[model samples]
Target: DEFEEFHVPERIIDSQRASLEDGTSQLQYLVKWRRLNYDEATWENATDIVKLAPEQVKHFQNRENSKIL
Candidate 1:
C-alpha cells in the first residue's frame, strides 16, 4: 500500500493550537499514525481527528480540562 500510514491515525498523543494572524486560533492534535513511531507522530487538524478518534479526543479533553496540565 502506498502511503497507507499517512492516512491511518492509530492514536492521539496530545492536543495543541496554532494562533491565527487575527485573534482566533485553530485547534490541532498530535497524531500517532499507524505503522509510525512516536517520534514520527504528526500534528493533524482537530476537526478531522475528532471524527477519526472521538474517544481518544474525549479522554484528552477530560484530562486537560481538570488535570495538573
Candidate 2:
C-alpha cells in the first residue's frame, strides 16, 4: 500500500481485525504506506516504535488477513 492523503479504505479497516486474531499487527504498514506518504504529522507521530503505544498500535493493524496487491 502506498501512502496518500486520501481516506483509508474499508479493507484496511478489515485487515486490522484479522491481525488481532494472531497476536500480531501491521500498523507499521499503515505508517510506511499511507501516513508517511501523506501525513507527515502522522508519520512523525509514528516515527519510532517507542512513540507508538503498544496497545494502540494493534488498533491500526490489518483488518483483512489476505489482501494481495
Candidate 3:
C-alpha cells in the first residue's frame, strides 16, 4: 500500500536529450508511470508524450538550450 500511496500516476517527469537514429531524428523523454519504480522509467517520443504534458516538453527544451551555453 505504501507504493500506491506515493504513486506518481502516468506522467512525463522530464526530457533528457534528443538524438538522431538511423538518419531519423527522434525526441525522447524520461517517462514515469503510476506506482512504478525508477527502474521502470523509459524513454518516450515527443509526439506521443506531448499530448500528455506540454510543460514537461518545454522544460526539456530549456534544459537542452542551457546545456548549449
Candidate 4:
C-alpha cells in the first residue's frame, strides 16, 4: 500500500530524548496516527505534537511516569 500521512494522530506510543550535535536536545515522540499502523508511525517533535495534542502528551507523561517531576 502507498504511504499516507493525512491524519493528525490517535495517540503517542512512546517518546525518546534526542540529543543533537548542536549541543541541544529535544524529545521525539512515536506518532501513532489515525488510519495508520505502528509500522507506518514516525518520530516527531514533541513541541508540535504538544501543540496539537496536549492531553495525549499528559497521558504519555503520566504513563511513562518520568522521574523529572
Candidate 5:
C-alpha cells in the first residue's frame, strides 16, 4: 500500500518508538552496569521486539521494493 500519510496503528507507532528508546537506554544501561559486557541475547531481543510493531512487520513481510525500511 502506498504510504501517502503517516497513518499506522497506535500500537505499532508506540511500539516502534518504545523499541528504539528502550534499546538505546539498554545500551546506555549496559555501559553503566557492565562497562560493555552486555548480553548479546538481550540486544538481539530488543531488535526482535521492534519487529512486533505492526506497520514495520507488515511492510517488511509483504512489500516488494518497499523503501520504508
Candidate 6:
C-alpha cells in the first residue's frame, strides 16, 4: 500500500466537540500534529486522521495512558 511507507506524525487531541456544519450534528476532534512546528501544526479532524494513520493514533493514546500514572 502506498501508505505503508508513510511517516506517522505524532498526534494529540487538542479539542473535541459536536458541530452542525453538516446539517446533522457530528462529533469531531481537533488534532494537533506534534512532529510539525507551531506554525506548521494545524488542527485536523480526528476521523480523517485515523483513516490516514491509525498507528499514530494508537501511539499517541499509549503516551497519554503512561502519563495517567
Where model 6 places Cα greater than 4 Å from the true spot, the runs are 1-8, 21-23, 26-40, 59-67
Give candidate 2 regions above 4 Å deviation.
1-41, 45-47, 62-69
Best by lDDT: 1
Colliding residue pairs in candidate 5 = none
Clashes of each: 0, 11, 0, 0, 0, 0
What's the candidate order when arranged by decreasing TM-score?
Answer: 4, 1, 3, 6, 2, 5
Q: Residue 7 deviation, candidate 6, in Å?
A: 7.2
Clashing pairs in 3: none
lDDT of 4 by residue, 1-69 (tens): 423356566677889887886978988887777754444677888877776666777787687877557
Q: Estimate each model's TM-score.
A: 0.61, 0.23, 0.47, 0.67, 0.19, 0.45
2 or 4, greater by TM-score: 4
Q: Give lDDT tens digits, candidate 6, residues 1-69.
A: 556344444565543546788786653445544454443345556666667656755665466557556
lDDT digits (tens) for residues 1-69 of candidate 2: 434246332212221112455776443323332355454322323223224333333544432344563
Model 3, TM vs. native: 0.47
Candidate 4's TM-score reads: 0.67
Which residue pairs show collisions in model 4? Answer: none
Best candidate, TM-score:
4
Worst lDDT 10-window in candidate 2: 9-18
Regions of candidate 4 where Cα sits further than 4 Å from its true position: 1-6, 21-23, 36-39, 66-69
lDDT (10s digit) by residue, model 1, range 3-41: 434466777778888889797888998887775444468
Looking at model 6, which ten-residue stretch has the lowest summed lDDT? 32-41
Cand. 6 Cα-lDDT:
0.55
TM-score of 6: 0.45
